[PDB]
Amino acid sequence: TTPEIVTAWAAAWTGTNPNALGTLFAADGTYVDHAIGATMTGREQISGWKARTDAMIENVHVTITKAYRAGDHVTIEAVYGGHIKGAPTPFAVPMATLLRTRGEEITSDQDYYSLSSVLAQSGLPADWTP
Amino acid sequence: TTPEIVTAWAAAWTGTNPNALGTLFAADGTYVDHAIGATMTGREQISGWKARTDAMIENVHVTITKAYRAGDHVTIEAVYGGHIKGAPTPFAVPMATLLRTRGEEITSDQDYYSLSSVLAQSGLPADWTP
């Protein structure tokens, strides 16, 4: 079924502890969010990204539609939801996450989704920023 | 090592014959672009999607940076580039394409990328529509 690393990754994002995200990564792990264009390096910056995300978005949740592994590469099809603080409405958008692993740890995470969809569903202007 | 179907898929998108895209799919194959929210079903609609894309964007090209197969799933990490007609500048954005195959045919293609990056790099307003 679902690789354990995927379950853990979704729990870390859906949970309320920033360190739970960072602890899944190796010391040299990288995290890139392609919708926002943000790159984090190392466990502390990664955990900080979950913290920052929660600062701006309430009730963030990531649910797994499906995931598959090919050796040390893992692909995840997920739905990313939440409510941007102050926004008229919540959002739920499709997202793909590509992980590279080493042993039990993540060395690279890339998240692909469209920010335009998040904003549009949220009832925010298309050019909106925090 | 890149699956043959991946090379064909990229050539199809990068060439000018729109039918090159639909020929790669099974009769019941589906195509979903998550950035635009467009769903196409069957060969005729899929080839029509390449034609529609070419009508609004010149020099459409998809470049493969990596691809890996897990059973009937194939994950592609790519760069989608081109130049929206009338835009002051071109674009090149990271994209993830998730394919499902049956034999040598594609039964599913889902494309994940951020429309906002495409528009911003193009010099276009975030609410731009064709």
Numbering used by the authors:
A (entry chain A), B (entry chain B): 2 to 131
Published text:
Caci_0382 is one of these genes, which encodes for a 134 amino-acid putative protein with a molecular weight of 14.3 kDa.
The most prominent hit was TMA, for which the Tm shift reaches 16 °C at 100 mM. Structural comparison reveals that the Caci_0382 structure in apo-form and in complex with TMA are very similar and could be aligned with an average RMSD value of 0.4 Å for individual subunits (131 Cα atoms). The negative potential and the size of the channel suggest that Caci_0382 may prefer to bind small positively charged ligand(s) such as the TMA and Imidazole identified in the FTS experiments. The three CH3 groups of the ligand point to hydrophobic protein side chains: V61, V63, M96, and to the side chain of Y81. The position of the water molecule that makes hydrogen bonds to D34, D112 and W50 in the Caci_0382 binding site could be a hydrolytic water and D34 a general acid catalyst as both are conserved in the LEH structure and play an important role in catalysis.
